[PDB]
């Protein structure tokens, strides 16, 4: 009766250190629609995060894009933290610029 | 433009 979210974390444009970009966390395929999504910088919640309007796919599962303007660097570590009723504890997915 | 639906299509 419930479907756990898929999570992808990636940038809007190809990542180039020192160049302003957008960090994205795409959550999809989940049901029901209540979901908690945080973008993390070095393990800390980023405050200025927007999201697309909740929609759903032909299979009725929901999807959302969370995004925030960021300027990547060599050292800074970014991630997406997701909680949903299907999850016992939040799932953390690290931003890997090759994925 | 949406369909002008009414309460006659309550489930």
């Amino acid at each position: 009766i419930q479907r756990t979210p898929k999570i992808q974390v990636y940038s809007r444009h190809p990542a180039e250190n020192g160049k302003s970009n957008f960090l994205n966390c795409y959550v999809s395929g989940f049901h029901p629609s209540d979901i908690e999504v945080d973008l993390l910088k070095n393990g800390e919640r980023i405050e200025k995060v927007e999201h697309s309007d909740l929609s759903f796919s032909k299979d009725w599962s929901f999807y959302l894009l969370y995004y925030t303007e960021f300027t990547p660097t060599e050292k800074d570590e970014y991630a997406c933290r997701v909680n949903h009723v299907t999850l016992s504890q939040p799932k953390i997915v690290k931003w890997d610029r090759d994925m | 433009h949406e369909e002008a639906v009414s309460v006659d299509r309550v489930l």
């Binding site: 809007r12 395929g29 697309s52 909740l54 759903f56 894009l65 | 433009h1 949406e2 369909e3 639906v5």
Partner: protein
């Protein structure tokens, strides 16, 4: 050349936290163009694409009234559904629907849709004939009976063959600079050793619209379906989409592998190599 318009409705009950929230979004193809949220400070239909903004106050008033009426209808439907399934008043439930039209390249109606799901399960759907229903279970059979008496299918058919097609055509003209522009993928292949004797070849597609795309790997001309790791197509946030496909290959055998890309925006299909 093919296009579609689709509205998506969702109502979600939340015992102890007020009346069920109701949301509508409308799409042409892969472009969201309108939204409504009953939880908004001042709920109204709002534009989400520049080409819909030129519709006048009368459009927005009518669209908003429809959404306000739907808020009430969907709340009543959720109450009914709870009883149809002998469910307690304690739990939270979801009612979803989607409806709209698909046009073929000729610009005529190719197919219409009006269907519902309850708690993520298909509940009832207008058949392709636009005259009859398919009900999933004995609860939906009740709905089917009410809808047949109310002549709901006839209303859908008339809307789907008339208003839906005409306004989609209007939207396509008003937004042709984007809605009818296919943006091809920018593509490349990356290579990442995993160990001394194998590496990942990853084929990238970026910046494309619409979302539909095919990315595959071939080894010696043969499709690597089972051995290809494909990620779900994902939105970039600037209207465009991204996808990649990866295969693990023995070190030194990279030249045996080819990536193949097909997309509406491309002059000709692409063949990529590392």
């Amino acid at each position: 050349g093919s296009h579609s318009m689709r509205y998506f409705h969702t109502a979600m009950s939340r015992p102890g936290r007020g009346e069920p929230r109701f949301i509508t979004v409308g799409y042409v193809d892969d472009t969201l163009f309108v939204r409504f949220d009953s939880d908004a400070t001042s709920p109204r239909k709002e534009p989400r694409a520049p080409w819909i903004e030129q519709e006048g106050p009368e459009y927005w008033d009518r669209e908003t009234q429809i959404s306000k009426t739907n808020t009430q209808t969907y709340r009543e439907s959720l109450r009914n559904l709870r009883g149809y399934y002998n469910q307690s008043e304690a739990g939270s439930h979801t009612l979803q629907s989607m409806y709209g039209c698909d046009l073929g390249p000729d610009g005529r109606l190719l197919r219409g849709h009006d269907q519902y799901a309850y708690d993520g399960k298909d509940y009832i759907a207008l058949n392709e004939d636009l005259r009859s229903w398919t009900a999933a279970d004995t609860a939906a059979q009740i709905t089917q009976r009410k809808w047949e008496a109310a002549r709901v299918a006839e209303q859908d058919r008339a809307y789907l063959e008339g208003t839906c097609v005409e306004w989609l055509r209007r939207y396509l003209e008003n937004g042709k600079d984007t809605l009818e522009r296919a943006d091809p993928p920018k593509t490349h292949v990356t290579h990442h050793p995993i160990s001394d004797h194998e590496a990942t070849l990853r084929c990238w597609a970026l910046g494309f619209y619409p979302a539909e795309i095919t990315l595959t790997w071939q080894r010696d001309g043969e499709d690597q379906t089972q051995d290809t790791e494909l990620v779900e197509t994902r939105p970039a946030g600037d209207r465009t989409f991204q996808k990649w496909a990866a295969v693990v290959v023995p070190s030194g055998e990279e030249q045996r592998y080819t990536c193949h890309v097909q997309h509406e925006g491309l002059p000709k299909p692409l063949t990529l190599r590392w």
